[PDB]
């Protein structure tokens, strides 16, 4: 999986960066379209890759 998503506050003055291996750790934050596209595949993820 490519580079992971990024977080940011409302004004975008601060921005966190996370890798792919940790996207399963912050699923509660990602948008819906990005969440529904990630949960059904969470089963197949191993560390940062997809089987």
Partner 1 sequence: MSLLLTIAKEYKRLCQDAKAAQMMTVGTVSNYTTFKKWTTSRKEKNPSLRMRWAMSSKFPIIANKRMLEEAQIPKEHNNVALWEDTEDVSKRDHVLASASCINYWNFCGPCVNNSEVIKEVYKSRFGRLERRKEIMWKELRFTLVDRQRRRVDTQPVEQRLRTGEIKDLQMWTLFEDEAPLASKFILDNYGLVKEMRSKFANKPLNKEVVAHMLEKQFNPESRFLPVFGAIRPERMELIHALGGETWIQEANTAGISNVDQRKNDIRAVCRKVCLAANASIMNAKSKLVEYIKSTSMRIGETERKLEELILETDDVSPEVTLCKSALGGQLGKTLSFGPMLLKKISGSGVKVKDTVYIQGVRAVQFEYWSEQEEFYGEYKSATALFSRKERSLEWITIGGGINEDRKRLLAMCMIFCRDGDYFKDAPATITMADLSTKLGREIPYQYVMMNWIQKSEDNLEALLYSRGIVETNPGKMGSSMGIDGSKRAIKSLRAVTIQSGKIDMPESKEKIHLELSDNLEAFDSSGRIVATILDLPSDKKVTFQDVSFQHPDLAVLRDEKTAITKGYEALIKRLGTGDNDIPSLIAKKDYLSLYNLPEVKLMAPLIRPNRKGVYSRVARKLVSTQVTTGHYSLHELIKVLPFTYFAPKQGMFEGRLFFSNDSFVEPGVNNNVFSWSKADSSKIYCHGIAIRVPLVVGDEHMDTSLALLEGFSVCENDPRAPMVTRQDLIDVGFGQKVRLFVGQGSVRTFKRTASQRAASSDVNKNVKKIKM
Q: Which residues have a Cβ under 8 Å from the Cβ of 5 and sit 6 or more positions away?
A: 18, 23, 30, 34
Q: Which residues have a Cβ under 8 Å from the Cβ of 23 and sit 6 or more positions away?
A: 1, 4, 5, 30, 38
> Could you say whether residue 13 binds partner 1 (CB under 8 A)?
yes
Using CB under 8 A, pick the residue from 2, 6, 10, 14 that binds partner 1.
14
> Could you say whether residue 10 binds partner 1 (CB under 8 A)?
no
What is the smallest separation between the CB atom of 14 and partner 1, expressed in angstroms?
Answer: 6
Q: How far apart are CA 12 and CA 37, in angstroms?
A: 24
What is the smallest separation between the CB atom of 9 and partner 1, expressed in angstroms?
Answer: 8
Q: Which residue ranges make up the site for partner 1 (CB under 8 A)?
A: 11, 13-14
């Amino acid at each position: 999986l490519g580079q992971g998503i990024r977080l940011s506050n409302k004004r975008k003055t601060k921005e966190v960066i996370i890798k792919a291996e940790k996207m399963g750790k912050y699923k509660n934050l990602m948008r819906e379209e990005y969440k529904n596209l990630f949960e059904p595949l969470e089963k197949y993820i191993q560390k940062d890759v997809c089987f």
